[PDB]
Every structure is written in structure tokens, then in C-alpha cells.
Point group: C3
Chain length 283, copies 3
């Protein structure tokens, strides 16, 4: 909605004429993972406010930025600060950047996010390779593809069964081994809820019964739009808290030093994404 | 902003009265043709066509109404339905059903093309719709949202008896005596908003929820119809099997079209 | 603001109310359908129609009543707003924010629900222990949009929505009441409505672990918790939801009355600053 094809094109063209960079891979940084932009080399920064047609920031803190550069050698463009539905953005604004990435000539999207753990076996700071998703907003009509289809992007009714690239998953699992980590790289299903409130125990139990392994309030729309455009997609959730799944466990004690360990866990995810650039196929 | 109804009662009545004075036909039955089943209109006798663009207040397509007799029965047939995924609000989607009621229709037949969730189902099957699951409805996308007009129905219409019991018995028995190679399957249709297809994980929740087939239509129309007091029955043509783990059609539509014709005889009189 | 109210708006309303009433309420009660008879038990009552009150959404019935109930200063809302009537949730929950800025610290919610737990009988009272916010899952959450920290957190916890202390005291007051039916306890699921559930829909609500279903309340509770209001509430079971294909107005007036009297009794058991 709201944007014409020309808008997307005008934006891609503007970016293309104001940077010499030509990215192949786009990375969307989740909450706490913005430090990935510091890992880029020969970086060139664009504040959203400079970029024509880019949705204005409505939220506290600085407007986000698009950072171009190389990540372990690979030509990348990186979004720091994503738009969320819960902040009152429509989905067509949330996913505006993904369409622009396509027109930039990007062929791969990496998504990161911070998630609540639903699978009992997960621990705070685990990384979960996303194998699949459940789109709750989507079932009810909040789907970023709603409205007339543009065949210049893709098909009317795109398949999502193969959303998370199988080759990249095999290669993530295989690269993880060489890094010799304490814990295994987890694999499972991300469920999107609109938020912003956190789940009740009842709601946490439904989400488990539905087969979700991790929950958050982002990502899925970007992935749907990415696949519509024929982008290759892989992604990771950093598990930032275990979701409370019983009333007995409302005998709960908080330890505020869970935030130094979380900087370390974010850092591990940032460096794992970085290294995986070696394993993405070239165009 | 969601479900901001632009239609007054007067608008619905103006449309019904325009159609009533531009054709002598007086339908008892309205039939909504799903994707690939528009050829049902060729079966009508004594037909008159109205393009949607010609009829007042009717939503514009991106479409026609055909009146006629189907196997002797006074019908109105909708060829080219509106879908939520195209960006139509549900009050535009179900506008035709309001109009049909004011035309005099007492029965709605809904047909659609669906994905198979029940593993028993095969491509080309016909599923008699026993019940539904309205996922959009749970969250707010219900075509009855807004002030209720008692001229149409109650504030809180019951939906447990949505798919007429008698018609389900007569469809099961009429099929039996057609002696078909395939059994007439029966189950729950789940509506999702669309337009993207299900992931393996979403296909599995839909199965867990007890749905046998999935699609992106029909349910709003059924709800509006029951609000109005219409008898309802319907069928899904199974066009694909939904992928549920991590690993021709023209003829089958024709079989449905012909089964719908035959079943006109089983519908009670007004 | 577009699609909402600013802090200034809610404050303007609360200040207006506060300079047009003598009452300073501690407890707010939002009455469900058929349960508004409590308002006639308020002493030193003072009544405002919604159209009287700045920024208040106009019902399309509906009033606000301040007074004392069983020794406690209350504000009572008769004729709540529902999503199915076409109201956005930021209108539905507008009064809860006003109540907070009035100085209320406790919200009592009642509603009329369909029974999904097979054990529940028509006329039963269910103490709400938890909820499932179906519309919340998909976008319809009253906190959607810009957040003001004068009300609460960006990502508020709802694990503890239904106050544990009141829950125990309700159970305890019921035991001493001598009532013959047990006081039921379970999860309320909100559906947007207005159409009632199919058999298939009822069965998913059951599999999801919900004990009773209705079309209200959850939004008010979320906004209340976001505000730090203490919350407890009750569902009167008005019908058993048809759960299989097998397929009274005066008994429900008595059952409603019983709920009204239970809320009035419990005024005495709410903590007091
Ligand atoms: N990290 C998280 N934890 C809980 F409990 N609920 C959530 N909903 C979205 N994200 C969440
Ligand atoms: N035929 C279909 N297949 C899948 F997977 N999803 C759908 N959603 C609606 N129709 C559908
Ligand atoms: N009381 C009720 N009964 C049924 F059947 N469905 C409902 N949906 C909301 N309330 C309901």
C-alpha cells in the first residue's frame, strides 16, 4: 500500500548514485545486535532521514541507518533499527526496505532478532537457526502482501514452505562445529505475535502447543516479502529470556547481571553471522 | 482503521431494487462460484447477465452476476468473487450477500478451491463443508463488525448450525447414487487471510486445529448469509495438497459444476 | 495524536472529572452485560453521561457513576465499549487510563461468557485466573503505537495479570458465604465477535486451554496492568458453548444478582492505602 513501484525504484536509484557500494547480502539487525554495523569495513552510513521515501522514525532514540560495506569480504548492506508493527507502523512501511534491497540487486537476506524461548531445552543466550515460522498476524489479515500484486516483484500466491534456505542451514550447522562452542546451535520455529505486551502463561502454552520454539514481534513480514521477490533467506534468533510457562514458576527471582552475559551472547551471534559470509554463494 | 462500513441500508435496497426492475428473474438460490468454476454459468437456461460495473454500489473488480434457471431452479450466480487479500474490506466482500437477501434469495451455495490438509484427501476431491474455522474473525476481521441492523439479523448470530444439516444429507445420498469412483469427503474449512501460502509449521497448526481444507474465502459470505437467515451449503474443490513435512483440474471442476446442478433438485421450495 | 490520545488528553479528562466531582475513587468497576445493577447500590452517587465528559467516546446508553459501595470509594462504568461495535481498542480502553489518573489503584472487571470447560454450568461464576488475547496475537492490542512511560513499560509483563491476593480472598469469601456451587477458576479467552462460535471454533478454543469465552475485558486488563492497577475479575457463564454435532431468562437474572452481590461483598477485602 502507500508506495508505488516508482517510489521503490527512485529510492534504489538514489542510493545507487550516492554510494559506490553494490551489496549482494542484506542483513537486518535485531535489538541488541546493532553492533554488527561496526564489523563492516570500508563502511558508508546513510541515516534514514537522508534517503528519499524512507519511513520517518516515530520512536525514541536516533532514526536508524543503512550501512554499506564489506563483512568478511562480502559486499553488504545493513539495517540498524527496524520498524515494528507494535510501534504503529503498517506492514507496507515495515517491509519497504526489503523491496528496495531487491532493486539494489541484493540476492540474500539475513534476519536477526531477539526472541523469548518457548522450547524448555533452550537457555538464555542460545542462538536458534530459524527453520520455519508461524505468522499469527498473517492468518488474520496483517500480511505485508495484502493488496494488488506487482508481478515486477513476484507472484500472487507465493510458496513459503521453503522460506528458510536449506543449504545455508546445513552450512550454519557445519560451520558451528568448527567454532567449538560450549552449547549447540539450536534449530526451530519462530512464531510472530504483534505485541507489544509479553505473554501470559496461558498464551505461552498455546504458542508451545502450536509448535513454536521461540517468540518475538518482528522478522516474519520481511521474510515473506523477501521470498516474494525471490531472495534467499536465512536467520537467527538470540534467546534473551525463557518465557514463563507455569504458575508454579511465578516463584521467580531476577538477577540484573543477566545484561552483561547478554552483551557477550549478542557478540557471539554477531561474529557467527560475520563468518558465515564465507558460505553464502556468489551471484 | 479497519471495517469502516460505507454501505447504508438504503444502498443495499437501492441495489436490490435496481436489479429487480432490470430483470424479471426472481432467484431462490444464490451460488458463489470459486476460482475455476465460472463455467457453471454456461449451464443456466434463460439467462440474463449484469456486469458489476453496471450495477449501482457494487464493488469494482481487478466480474458478473448471471440470473437463470439451473436444472429448473431460479438462480443468481456470482462469477468472480472479491477477496480480502486483494485489499477489499470484508464489508465489500460480503456486500453481494446482503443484496441477495433483499432480492428474495433463501439459499446460498458457496464453492471454492482449497488446499488439502487432511491426508486422506487427494487432488481433485470434493469436500462437502460441514463446518468452518474463521481465523480472521477471532482477531477482529468479521464482516458483522459495526452497528447491527436488525432489519438483517441479530447482534450475536449463532454459527453452530451454519451448514444446513438436511442439505448435507441429500448431498451425501445423491452422490452415493451417482456411483462415483471417489467418495465425497466431508470436513472443516479454515479461512486464512492470504495471499501467501502456508509454511510447514502453519500447515501443522491448521491440522492441529482440526481443519481438513484451507482457503482464503467463503467464510465471510457464510456468516453474513446466516445473519440474514439464509440456508447455506457448500463445497471445496481440493486443488493441491498442503506440504506438511520437510522433504486433470479442468475435469474435476466440471464434476463439481455438474454435481451442483444435480443438487438443485434437493433444495427445498420457498 | 492520530489514532489515539496523548497524555495531555487523558489528563485533561481526569482533571475535568476531578473538579466536577467531590469523590476521589480508589476502586473502579467495569460491569458486564446484565451486571450493571450495582450502580443503584452506590451512596452519595454522582452521575456523568459520557457525552458530558471531555474526550470521552460517545456510545453508539452509557454512563459513569461515582459513589460508595460497601464502604469503598468507587467509580462505576455502566455500558462498556466493545470492539465488535466498531470501536478501536484505544477507545475501548480510554476510561482505564483516565481511572488511573483519577487515583484508582484497583480495577474489577465482570463479564458474561460462554462456557468451554465441560464442568461449568449455566449460572456458574468463574474467577478469572488468566487470559488468552486472540486479537492481541495478530495486531489488535490496545498498547499498539507510541508508549508513554508515565503510564508504563514498552513491553509489559502479563504473567501476573490477575492479582493473586484477591484471588485467594475471593475463594475465601466464597467459602464463608456457604454457596452450594463451587467458585470456578480458569482462563478467559477473548474473541473479537460478534458472531458466536462454530462447533469447530469451540473445539480449538478448548484445545487451546480456555475455560470460558467472551468478547471483552482482556483489553481493559492489559491497559490496567500496563498502568500498575491491581486487577481481579469474574465471568458469569451465561451459556454452554455447543461442542459437538449432536444438536431461563429469570434463572440468569438470579445468577447475575449473585455476582453483583459477590463483588459488593469483596469491596471489604480489597487492600487499603
Ligand atoms: N521475548 C519475549 N518474551 C515473552 F514472554 N513474550 C514475548 N513476545 C515477544 N517477545 C517476547
Ligand atoms: N491452496 C492453498 N495452499 C496453501 F498452502 N495455503 C493456502 N491458503 C489458502 N489456500 C491455500
Ligand atoms: N457467550 C458466548 N457463546 C458462544 F457460543 N460464543 C461466544 N463468543 C463470545 N461469547 C460467546
Amino acid at each position: 500500500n502507500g508506495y508505488t513501484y516508482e517510489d521503490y525504484k527512485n529510492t534504489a536509484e538514489w542510493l545507487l548514485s550516492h554510494t559506490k557500494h553494490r551489496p549482494q547480502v542484506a542483513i537486518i539487525c535485531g535489538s541488541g545486535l546493532g553492533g554488527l554495523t561496526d564489523k563492516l569495513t570500508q563502511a558508508q552510513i546513510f541515516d534514514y532521514g537522508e534517503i528519499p521515501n524512507f519511513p520517518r522514525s516515530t520512536v525514541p532514540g536516533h532514526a536508524g541507518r543503512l550501512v554499506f560495506g564489506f563483512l568478511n569480504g562480502r559486499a553488504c548492506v545493513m539495517m540498524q533499527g527496524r520498524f515494528h508493527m507494535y510501534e504503529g507502523y503498517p506492514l507496507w512501511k515495515v517491509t519497504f526496505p526489503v523491496r528496495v534491497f531487491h532493486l539494489l540487486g541484493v540476492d540474500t537476506l539475513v534476519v536477526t532478532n531477539a526472541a523469548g524461548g518457548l522450547n524448555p531445552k533452550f537457555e538464555v543466550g542460545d542462538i536458534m537457526l530459524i527453520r520455519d515460522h508461524i505468522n499469527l498476524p498473517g492468518f488474520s489479515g496483517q500480511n505485508p502482501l495484502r493488496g494488488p500484486n506487482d508481478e515486477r516483484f513476484g507472484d500472487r500466491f507465493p510458496a513459503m514452505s521453503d522460506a528458510y534456505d536449506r543449504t545455508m542451514r546445513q552450512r550454519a550447522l557445519s560451520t558451528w562445529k568448527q567454532m567449538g562452542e560450549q552449547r549447540e546451535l539450536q534449530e526451530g520455529t519462530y512464531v510472530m505475535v504483534a505485541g507489544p505486551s509479553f505473554q501470559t502463561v496461558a498464551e505461552c502454552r498455546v504458542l508451545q502447543k502450536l509448535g513454536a520454539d521461540a517468540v518475538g514481534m518482528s522478522t516474519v513480514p520481511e521474510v515473506i516479502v523477501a521470498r516474494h521477490c525471490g531472495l534467499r533467506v536465512f536467520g537467527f534468533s538470540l534467546i534473551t529470556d525463557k518465557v514463563i510457562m507455569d504458575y508454579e514458576s511465578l516463584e521467580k527471582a531476577n538477577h540484573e547481571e543477566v545484561l552483561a552475559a547478554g552483551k557477550q551472547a549478542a557478540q557471539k551471534l554477531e561474529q557467527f553471522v560475520s563468518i558465515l559470509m564465507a558460505s553464502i554463494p556468489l551471484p
